[PDB]
Structures are given as structure tokens and as C-alpha cells.
């Protein structure tokens, strides 16, 4: 399913992930299209920072959902 | 374990991965001079209670707290 990652600069990134993908996997995919190390980035959704352990299904990320990227 | 505390200045603290909130406010008082009874630590949008520990709120390495 295609999701979105709205950076903190207005830019919106389109990712293709499965509901069974962990956050570490998502951050890995973001690195491929931005070159940003997973350890330099944090993901916020529904008003909560995503743990690198859980998956998308755990945080209940559906199709066409949009995460926000906040560099650290 | 090393952590941070945003007062506008910032202080670096060396504590244990499971140190209680009470033990932290004790160290902050030694470095800043602020009485524990007059300092509130905020993290993850939720205020830390002196009854719990750091491991509870998942205070990882180089985490950043806030004094209010």
C-alpha cells in the first residue's frame, strides 16, 4: 500500500510498504530516497513517535496514510 | 547512561538506565541548585512522577527532558 511521509519542509514522499513492515523497515526505505540515516530521523503519527520495534499494523497505519518526518 | 535536560541552558546528566525520577531530580539539584520539590520534568508529552523510574517512560540514551 502506498503511504506518504510529509517532511518538515512541506515536501511529501511517496512510499510503498506492507502493513507488516516494521518502523525500522520504513526508515530504511526513506533512506533510499533521501539518504537520511534511520538513526537521524524520527516518525510521528496520530500524535505519537513510532518505536523501531513495532510495525505498521501495530500503530494501525492504513492505506493512503501520512507520517511526518522530524530529523534529530 | 547520558541524558539531557532543557531548562534556556542545557545540562548533561550521567545516570543509570533505570534510575528513578527522584534520583534524577537529586542530581539536577546538585548541578543547577533547583530544589526537587520545585521542578517538573516533562517527556513524551507526559509529566514524570517521582514514584516511577526512567526505564518506565522508555528514557533511552541521549534522551532529552524538559524542566518546568
Amino acid at each position: 500500500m502506498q503511504i506518504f511521509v510529509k517532511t518538515l519542509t512541506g515536501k511529501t514522499i511517496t512510499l510503498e510498504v506492507e502493513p507488516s513492515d516494521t518502523i525500522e523497515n520504513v526508515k530504511a526505505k526513506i533512506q533510499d530516497k533521501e539518504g537520511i540515516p534511520p538513526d537521524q530521523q524520527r516518525l510521528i503519527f496520530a500524535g505519537k513517535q513510532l518505536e523501531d520495534g513495532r510495525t505498521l499494523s501495530d500503530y494501525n497505519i492504513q492505506k493512503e496514510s501520512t507520517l511526518h518526518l522530524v530529523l534529530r | 547512561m547520558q541524558i539531557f535536560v532543557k531548562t534556556g541552558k542545557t545540562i548533561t546528566l550521567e545516570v543509570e538506565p533505570s534510575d528513578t525520577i527522584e534520583n534524577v531530580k537529586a542530581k539536577i539539584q546538585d548541578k543547577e541548585g533547583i530544589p526537587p520539590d520545585q521542578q517538573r520534568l516533562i517527556f513524551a508529552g507526559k509529566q514524570l512522577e517521582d514514584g516511577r523510574t526512567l526505564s518506565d517512560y522508555n528514557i533511552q540514551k541521549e534522551s532529552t527532558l524538559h524542566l518546568v
Binding site: L8, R42, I44, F45, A46, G47, K48, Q49, H68, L69, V70 | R40, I42, F43, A44, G45, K46, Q47, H66, V68
Partner: peptide, 30 residues
């Protein structure tokens, strides 16, 4: 006081006692 507010920048649910986003430092009111 107040109630937990969502940082307009990344929707992060911050604490009322704070005036800036805990994740991006973006102010609460603008």
C-alpha cells in the same frame, strides 16, 4: 492549566506546560 495539544508541524501530542513542539521545537501558537 490546559490540555495536551497536537504540534501543527508533525501532529505530535505535546504537553500543556510546553510552548514549543517537543519534536521540532515549533511554537504552539502562530
Amino acid at each position: 492549566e490546559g490540555a495536551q495539544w497536537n504540534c501543527t508541524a508533525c501532529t505530535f501530542l505535546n504537553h500543556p506546560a510546553l510552548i514549543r513542539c517537543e519534536q521540532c521545537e515549533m511554537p504552539r501558537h502562530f
